Amino acid sequence: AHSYAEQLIDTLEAQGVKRIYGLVGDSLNPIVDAVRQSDIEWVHVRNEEAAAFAAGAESLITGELAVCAASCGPGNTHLIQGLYDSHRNGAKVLAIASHIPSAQIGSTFFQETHPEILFKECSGYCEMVNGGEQGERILHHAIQSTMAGKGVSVVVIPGDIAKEDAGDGTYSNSTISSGTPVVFPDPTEAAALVEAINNAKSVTLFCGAGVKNARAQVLELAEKIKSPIGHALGGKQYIQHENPFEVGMSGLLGYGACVDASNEADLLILLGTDFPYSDFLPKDNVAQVDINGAHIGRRTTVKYPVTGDVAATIENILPHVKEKTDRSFLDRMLKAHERKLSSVVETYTHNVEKHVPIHPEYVASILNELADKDAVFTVDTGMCNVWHARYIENPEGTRDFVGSFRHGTMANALPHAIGAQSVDRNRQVIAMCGDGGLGMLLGELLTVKLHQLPLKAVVFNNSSLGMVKLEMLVEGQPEFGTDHEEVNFAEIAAAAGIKSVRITDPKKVREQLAEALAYPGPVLIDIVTDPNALS
Amino acid sequence: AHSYAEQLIDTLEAQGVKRIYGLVGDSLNPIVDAVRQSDIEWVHVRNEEAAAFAAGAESLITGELAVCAASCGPGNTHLIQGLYDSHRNGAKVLAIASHIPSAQIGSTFFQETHPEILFKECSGYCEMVNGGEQGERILHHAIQSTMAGKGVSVVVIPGDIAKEDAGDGTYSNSTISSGTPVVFPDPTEAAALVEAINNAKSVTLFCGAGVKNARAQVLELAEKIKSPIGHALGGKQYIQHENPFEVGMSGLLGYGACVDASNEADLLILLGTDFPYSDFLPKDNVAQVDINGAHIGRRTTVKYPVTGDVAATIENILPHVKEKTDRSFLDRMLKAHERKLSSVVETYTHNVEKHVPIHPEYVASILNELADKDAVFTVDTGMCNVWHARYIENPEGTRDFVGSFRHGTMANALPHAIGAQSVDRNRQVIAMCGDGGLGMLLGELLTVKLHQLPLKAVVFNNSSLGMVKLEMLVEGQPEFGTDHEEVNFAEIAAAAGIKSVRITDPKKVREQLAEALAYPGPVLIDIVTDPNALSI
Amino acid sequence: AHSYAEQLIDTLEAQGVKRIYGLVGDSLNPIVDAVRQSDIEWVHVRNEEAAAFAAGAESLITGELAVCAASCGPGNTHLIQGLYDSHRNGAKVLAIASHIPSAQIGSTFFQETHPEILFKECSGYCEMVNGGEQGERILHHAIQSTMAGKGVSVVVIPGDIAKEDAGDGTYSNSTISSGTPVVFPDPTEAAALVEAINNAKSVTLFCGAGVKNARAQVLELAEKIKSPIGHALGGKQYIQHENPFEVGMSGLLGYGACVDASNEADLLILLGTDFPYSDFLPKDNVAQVDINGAHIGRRTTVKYPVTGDVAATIENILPHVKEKTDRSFLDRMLKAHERKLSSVVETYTHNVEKHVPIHPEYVASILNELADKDAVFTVDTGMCNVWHARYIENPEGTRDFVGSFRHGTMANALPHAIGAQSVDRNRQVIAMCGDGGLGMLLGELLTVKLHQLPLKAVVFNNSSLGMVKLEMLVEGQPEFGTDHEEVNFAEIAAAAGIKSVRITDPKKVREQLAEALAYPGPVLIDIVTDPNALS
Numbered sequence A, C: 001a002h003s004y005a006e007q008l009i010d011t012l013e014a015q016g017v018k019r020i021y022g023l024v025g026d027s028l029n030p031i032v033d034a035v036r037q038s039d040i041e042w043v044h045v046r047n048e049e050a051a052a053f054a055a056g057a058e059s060l061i062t063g064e065l066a067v068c069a070a071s072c073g074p075g076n077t078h079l080i081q082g083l084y085d086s087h088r089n090g091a092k093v094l095a096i097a098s099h100i101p102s103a104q105i106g107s108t109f110f111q112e113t114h115p116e117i118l119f120k121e122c123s124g125y126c127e128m129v130n131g132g133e134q135g136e137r138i139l140h141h142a143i144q145s146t147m148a149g150k151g152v153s154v155v156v157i158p159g160d161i162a163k164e165d166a167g168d169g170t171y172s173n174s175t176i177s178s179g180t181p182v183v184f185p186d187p188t189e190a191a192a193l194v195e196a197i198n199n200a201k202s203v204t205l206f207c208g209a210g211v212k213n214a215r216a217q218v219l220e221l222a223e224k225i226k227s228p229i230g231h232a233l234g235g236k237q238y239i240q241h242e243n244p245f246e247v248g249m250s251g252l253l254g255y256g257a258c259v260d261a262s263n264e265a266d267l268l269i270l271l272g273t274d275f276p277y278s279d280f281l282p283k284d285n286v287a288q289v290d291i292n293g294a295h296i297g298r299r300t301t302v303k304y305p306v307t308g309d310v311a312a313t314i315e316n317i318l319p320h321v322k323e324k325t326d327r328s329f330l331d332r333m334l335k336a337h338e339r340k341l342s343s344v345v346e347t348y349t350h351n352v353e354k355h356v357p358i359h360p361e362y363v364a365s366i367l368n369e370l371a372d373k374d375a376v377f378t379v380d381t382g383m384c385n386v387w388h389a390r391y392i393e394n395p396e397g398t399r400d401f402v403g404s405f406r407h408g409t410m411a412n413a414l415p416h417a418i419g420a421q422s423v424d425r426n427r428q429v430i431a432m433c434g435d436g437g438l439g440m441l442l443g444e445l446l447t448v449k450l451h452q453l454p455l456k457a458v459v460f461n462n463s464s465l466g467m468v469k470l471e472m473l474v475e476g477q478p479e480f481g482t483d484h485e486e487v488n489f490a491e492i493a494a495a496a497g498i499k500s501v502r503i504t505d506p507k508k509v510r511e512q513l514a515e516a517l518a519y520p521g522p523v524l525i526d527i528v529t530d531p532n533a534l535s
Numbered sequence B: 001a002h003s004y005a006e007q008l009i010d011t012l013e014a015q016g017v018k019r020i021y022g023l024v025g026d027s028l029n030p031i032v033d034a035v036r037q038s039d040i041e042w043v044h045v046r047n048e049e050a051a052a053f054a055a056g057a058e059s060l061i062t063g064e065l066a067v068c069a070a071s072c073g074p075g076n077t078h079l080i081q082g083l084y085d086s087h088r089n090g091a092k093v094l095a096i097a098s099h100i101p102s103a104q105i106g107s108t109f110f111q112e113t114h115p116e117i118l119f120k121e122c123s124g125y126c127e128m129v130n131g132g133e134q135g136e137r138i139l140h141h142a143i144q145s146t147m148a149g150k151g152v153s154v155v156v157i158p159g160d161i162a163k164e165d166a167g168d169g170t171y172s173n174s175t176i177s178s179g180t181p182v183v184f185p186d187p188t189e190a191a192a193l194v195e196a197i198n199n200a201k202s203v204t205l206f207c208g209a210g211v212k213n214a215r216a217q218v219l220e221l222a223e224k225i226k227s228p229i230g231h232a233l234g235g236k237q238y239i240q241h242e243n244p245f246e247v248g249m250s251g252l253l254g255y256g257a258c259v260d261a262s263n264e265a266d267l268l269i270l271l272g273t274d275f276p277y278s279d280f281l282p283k284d285n286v287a288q289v290d291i292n293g294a295h296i297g298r299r300t301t302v303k304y305p306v307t308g309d310v311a312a313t314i315e316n317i318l319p320h321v322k323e324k325t326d327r328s329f330l331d332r333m334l335k336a337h338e339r340k341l342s343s344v345v346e347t348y349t350h351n352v353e354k355h356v357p358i359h360p361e362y363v364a365s366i367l368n369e370l371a372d373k374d375a376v377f378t379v380d381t382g383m384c385n386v387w388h389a390r391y392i393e394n395p396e397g398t399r400d401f402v403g404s405f406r407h408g409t410m411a412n413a414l415p416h417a418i419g420a421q422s423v424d425r426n427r428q429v430i431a432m433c434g435d436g437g438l439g440m441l442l443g444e445l446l447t448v449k450l451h452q453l454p455l456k457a458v459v460f461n462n463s464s465l466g467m468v469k470l471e472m473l474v475e476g477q478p479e480f481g482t483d484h485e486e487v488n489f490a491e492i493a494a495a496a497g498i499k500s501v502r503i504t505d506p507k508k509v510r511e512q513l514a515e516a517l518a519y520p521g522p523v524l525i526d527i528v529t530d531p532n533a534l535s536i
């Protein structure tokens, strides 16, 4: 490795990077020449935004570093949406932002931007390379920052400097710390939490993504104190399945007795969650356990703050928590949960199989039953979040859920599916697309075709910005700009060389979805759904 | 108008705004409720990036304010590429960037970003609304800043504040200054330019977009001092046509004697240009006239700097410039121009009508001949810039050229054509698309269908990132990542409900293009072109 | 508390804030009206830069929240130097940056700046108040972010909004998490460190500020593996005293066998340090333990990275680390260290103690001997860092050292001393000032007089930018712009109403310093020191 471009790629290969998503051009050419000589695969995308989404999804699935790359000015500017999403999701992503020739910086040159400034909000590390040795340092610092969980890292590289001599290897020779530390709470904070639990007659646990490695501990605590368990959308994958305490979700796409259980308990314990809808949370007596102390109390009054890991905190407090024999609150909340879910099933199950346009809730129920027990589900922002949250389950805990749950951008599903599918072509990947989201990055159908990624793109084609239609109904606003003339995505996918099917009959949804999911290759399933569907 | 959302829309309609390009959602809903109750058309796009490009193109065509709007966080984040392009092009654009509810700012809320910080590099004005009266003020300042030529303006509006009471009208009642001032040069700088011209035995004029309102003055000066006229890409629309002094373009996509005339004249005069390729410009004896004094001397050694308008500077100096009777340099440069262009024709014009895959230069020649004399051409960044610069002409000066000439982003052609066509459906709009550029924002074919914009999308389908293929050949780099499996854009357009045709035979290009351009509706013409074809 | 200004001050008082350093004006007036009606003391400063340094120093001394406040535009702009210093030092500081009236934002008004953008690099949290309820939220998030160790927090408050209605109390009622969690390492990283230690025949420990709560563990590990212990400047306060393995410091102001021990050991272990001078560190076999994974390998090749707390990591690995019986390396390094220190004392003690102009090393030795065992020492950036590092010791560990060790700004000593002294007027505070540093913020002598803070300002008056004189000598540059005509700081302090003494005779330094340190009130000691004493 004589040039900085070669040293950068060799360092990524030695770190286990297998693929780089991007689109070649100008200042990125020396870097793509180094990827050509390496054993890293170059994954060409139609729009660099999709490369940043794909890298973020690959990272969420592998737990390892993922990389995207883009040319100068407008090239790396397209990464921004996907970098905000990957950053909010805590993905381990390195973005290679090629930059204009260093001699032209400051001269308002052709394509000039300041990415080293622009990307400061959507990254935990973002610096510009000014030479070989310094480039080697900031590449190490970028990788180490993202592997430590600080979010996206961006390395800005002027094209001429990528062709200059590499550094001496001092920083590229380092081992990267990528382990997960065990964060025990401060004994004083743990004691206050023990006191709050023992003195509450009824407790509710509200779990988020932070309980990922604490399932056994959360269930063990819930059994001891007879607490209903609710979950934020980010914790659904980990705590909803095989859980006899489950009371659902809160917020506008919530369901069941979670809102009641959270607001009626003597004590609410927020476990690894940053659920932002304050109006749904109580203020009277709340505890919060979070690994990042700065996140505690962001969403409601917290009287018992605990900086610590969920599993380690529960292991620390369990011997001091007295077993509660009064289950009346848990039983009352489980009955309320069942009564709410049964009222929906009793009212709507009878005529859903005959309703035209197809009910998206019926599609999601079938998708849950037909998809593999270890499938990856990617979820487009919009009404697909409602269908995923209420109908897609994770029995056996081997399914992965990837979405724009925090940044909330449309169009993530197909590019997320491209990244997730690239990890293992023998694993089923289902993209729950919206017609709005798919239309927004439609050219990524050409990426699916080019790389023959055998993902299953299920389009909930309601010819509408469905979620906006719902917002306007809630606000009392006459609908405007949300519904438009129908689009045939099955014909568009067929024209792009992808196997497709158009589903319009509710009586054929199950069989046609089954055949499409069994097809050994990419498939687009265009389902004509009701834009006004809601239970 | 009780709410700030209604006051904002009423202010835009009083300014003559006819359309807003965008995609509705969350915090933008109160604003679109006001647009619903107004004269303004709501133009739904598939990706907000296309709304920012469309607004920029509409503004370049009308010379008036154009508006784009987007929802909070990820919605307005998508405007960024189009805002950089509109800003670099000097478009008069207002971007309505809806923002998260004000009570959630600073709480790392769902969809939270800081657009009021993010858009500072791609705008001349960018501020956040925090109340009704203050919102009315910054709406005025944003419009006034962009109408005065300071580039894009961004107004960031938290959704809840759009529903609050409007201001009292003090700033919305103002007349906006949109006139063009006449910037005469400092007499000392003009005197130095007069002296430099009279002492030079030979002069060359190199013109850019700044000569837009100075054609008569530039030609009058060129006739008096017998100076060849070359041009930067941004000035091509204005000075190339009906010009007996024309010696072409400079830079890598240049042609003709422009580089010789610029480097051999006793004095080179840069007129309204910021041509960035320094290696092609002389350093010895250069004058520069620019309306923005900060731009002077950015690209080469300038000995005679002049802060001033091109037309006003030329009118100021003309009575003091002595007529040059010696035409030798002009004639020698016009002959050099012809010798350079004839060497290309002698080498490459051999069986072009039979070359397979179709030669893109042949397609561009035919497009130049068949398109209307007042057509709008939008140009995708890449090899289409080469075909546009060398083969699309502007006889009569009634054609408009819109492209990403300064920001250099791919995928601008179709969204620019959507904005340009929306101005007047009876005017022909031709989009010169690249397969890479069209694939990058492919969903905007659904926007063309939805609004039935009768534009003609000509896809130079070379199954390649053509320009990158050329860069790698020049740098001595083995080709990689540029060429990919073929895509049928005609079938994709047909599936999207747009009339289309696929052209693979060079003997049918002329007739099939003629039929497509005559069709009264949107058409996509997918032309399979040679990725290796180039006349050097 | 009806207004947001009152709610803000009530929230700070409920958090235990006793003082606010600042300078009143325009948009800050409603806030100082609320301070007037509270138990919080208002500490008027001459320059808002000093208020930010004072808050940072108070926080480093108490381990609790400290607050500074400034008026709109130019007022809060003056905080910036002190906020960079407090941020780099990890101080727990809240800066109240008053802002122009909200109706004028975006109109290029009189005094308009964008502090909510300007202060992003010198803070972990920086947001603008736009209403009562939102102001209450961001005040909580700012306090919680700084109390969790994320650095300075800035709250930007338009003056008119400070007078508007307060929020409902939801976020102000929260308990703030200020505990210290116990971070155990990932077992795989700890196992690699155990293997590296057991395979090394000789080990050296290089400690920084991160070993503050790990003294016992560091000494315990050092005894087991017979390792010399060196330290970075930030760790001097904690690991230098009562340490039989001590081999000094590294870098240009270093001394003793630290550089030799670090570079000759088979394994170097970086413990809680971010020492930036890479040229003094080895590259061949280095381990690093840091609580922030992003900091690992920033300064040299790290082969054994460990994300974890120093004390918890050592407790975790100790039972697996074999006792090293070979003491040869330790004894060789301790003999080298002792010979280096004793040789200097034997050779120079007489010339330094009698030298005219007074030798600054003699002044620092006297200060070490005469100052209380629990004194606070503040250190001005420049040659005073050399005198502090080499001669001020911390026997019993009850002294505090405050300086601009990371941001490296001049003029911090007197403002740091004002903050440290304000905590407890019965505790001795010694400010080691430079003539350049004191002259830079000379008006703060009026603050010392106004508040009668009984600190002892020792001016090392060498009529020079001493450290710059040394830089130019090392670079081979002819001296220029460093030395200027003598200033009489004792006469200036006397004119400002402060008790002062001018010391020019080395035979009187000890006696006159003893009298000055015993004086019950503020004292400025102007010592004419040798400008050619460059260590």
Ligand SMILES: Cc1cc2nc3c(=O)[nH]c(=O)nc-3n(C[C@H](O)[C@H](O)[C@H](O)COP(=O)(O)OP(=O)(O)OC[C@H]3O[C@@H](n4cnc5c(N)ncnc54)[C@H](O)[C@@H]3O)c2cc1C
Residues within 6 Å of the ligand: A207, A208, A209, A210, A211, A231, A232, A233, A234, A235, A236, A249, A250, A251, A252, A253, A254, A271, A272, A273, A274, A275, A276, A289, A290, A291, A292, A295, A308, A309, A310, A311, A381, A382, A385, A404, A405, A406, A408, A409, A467, B110
């Ligand atoms: C259209 C749309 C609508 C939405 N509607 C809703 C809705 O109605 N209901 C809903 O529930 N969601 C909703 N969401 C998502 C919502 O905005 C939030 O993103 C989500 O609820 C947060 O999930 P979380 O708390 O699991 O994850 P995060 O917000 O990522 O929080 C995880 C937290 O755990 C902490 N943590 C991580 N590891 C550990 C550890 N080991 N120990 C302790 N703490 C740790 C992190 O620091 C963080 O604070 C919606 C999303 C979309 C796109």
Ligand SMILES: Cc1cc2nc3c(=O)[nH]c(=O)nc-3n(C[C@H](O)[C@H](O)[C@H](O)COP(=O)(O)OP(=O)(O)OC[C@H]3O[C@@H](n4cnc5c(N)ncnc54)[C@H](O)[C@@H]3O)c2cc1C
Residues within 6 Å of the ligand: A110, B207, B208, B209, B210, B211, B231, B232, B233, B234, B235, B236, B249, B250, B251, B252, B253, B254, B271, B272, B273, B274, B275, B276, B289, B290, B291, B292, B295, B308, B309, B310, B311, B381, B382, B385, B404, B405, B406, B408
């Ligand atoms: C792929 C690609 C390749 C390119 N290759 C080339 C190439 O080889 N050759 C080439 O020519 N271009 C090339 N371009 C474009 C090139 O980068 C520049 O953007 C362009 O040449 C600048 O044109 P301009 O000077 O007319 O406009 P601008 O750069 O916009 O400059 C116009 C100037 O006029 C000034 N001005 C405005 N109004 C007035 C007035 N009334 N009076 C006086 N001054 C005024 C402005 O302040 C400004 O400084 C390329 C573009 C692309 C996309």
Ligand SMILES: Cc1cc2nc3c(=O)[nH]c(=O)nc-3n(C[C@H](O)[C@H](O)[C@H](O)COP(=O)(O)OP(=O)(O)OC[C@H]3O[C@@H](n4cnc5c(N)ncnc54)[C@H](O)[C@@H]3O)c2cc1C
Residues within 6 Å of the ligand: C207, C208, C209, C210, C211, C231, C232, C233, C234, C235, C236, C249, C250, C251, C252, C253, C254, C271, C272, C273, C274, C275, C276, C289, C290, C291, C292, C295, C308, C309, C310, C311, C381, C382, C385, C404, C405, C406, C408, C467
């Ligand atoms: C004029 C001047 C000259 C200087 N010259 C020198 C010189 O020659 N020599 C020198 O030594 N210094 C010198 N300094 C200071 C030097 O620049 C550094 O600031 C200093 O050496 C860093 O000290 P540190 O590593 O202890 O602290 P920091 O740089 O603050 O690093 C402490 C580290 O410990 C980590 N940490 C914190 N808590 C824990 C925990 N519980 N467990 C594990 N890790 C934890 C932190 O994450 C951080 O990485 C100079 C300063 C000045 C002003």
Ligand SMILES: Cc1ncc(C[n+]2csc(CCOP(=O)(O)OP(=O)(O)O)c2C)c(N)n1
Residues within 6 Å of the ligand: A380, A381, A382, A383, A384, A408, A409, A410, A411, A433, A434, A435, A436, A437, A438, A460, A462, A464, A465, A466, A467, A468, B023, B024, B025, B026, B071, B074, B075, B078
């Ligand atoms: C980039 C972007 N633009 C706009 C929005 C606002 N928004 C959120 S959901 C939604 C509608 C999504 O439509 P579609 O993808 O068809 O999903 P549906 O709700 O109809 O299932 C919109 C406009 C957004 N989140 N991201």
Ligand SMILES: Cc1ncc(C[n+]2csc(CCOP(=O)(O)OP(=O)(O)O)c2C)c(N)n1
Residues within 6 Å of the ligand: A023, A024, A025, A026, A071, A074, A075, A078, B380, B381, B382, B383, B384, B408, B409, B410, B411, B433, B434, B435, B436, B437, B438, B460, B462, B464, B465, B466, B467, B468
């Ligand atoms: C958003 C963006 N990404 C990348 C580039 C770099 N780039 C400039 S031209 C080009 C190739 C364009 O391909 P296509 O649109 O097919 O045009 P062609 O040159 O093949 O005619 C590329 C990759 C860019 N300018 N903008």
Ligand SMILES: Cc1ncc(C[n+]2csc(CCOP(=O)(O)OP(=O)(O)O)c2C)c(N)n1
Residues within 6 Å of the ligand: C380, C381, C382, C383, C384, C408, C409, C410, C411, C433, C434, C435, C436, C437, C438, C460, C462, C464, C465, C466, C467, C468
């Ligand atoms: C604000 C600031 N300006 C400049 C410097 C550069 N600098 C570092 S130390 C120093 C000299 C300090 O002089 P003085 O305070 O008299 O201390 P001395 O070295 O003479 O003891 C200078 C100029 C700095 N660190 N901070």
Ligand SMILES: [Mg+2]
Residues within 6 Å of the ligand: A434, A435, A436, A460, A461, A462, A463, A464, A465, A466
């Ligand atoms: Mg939809």
Ligand SMILES: [Mg+2]
Residues within 6 Å of the ligand: B434, B435, B436, B460, B461, B462, B463, B464, B465, B466
């Ligand atoms: Mg192409």
Ligand SMILES: [Mg+2]
Residues within 6 Å of the ligand: C434, C435, C436, C460, C461, C462, C463, C464, C465, C466
């Ligand atoms: Mg000095």
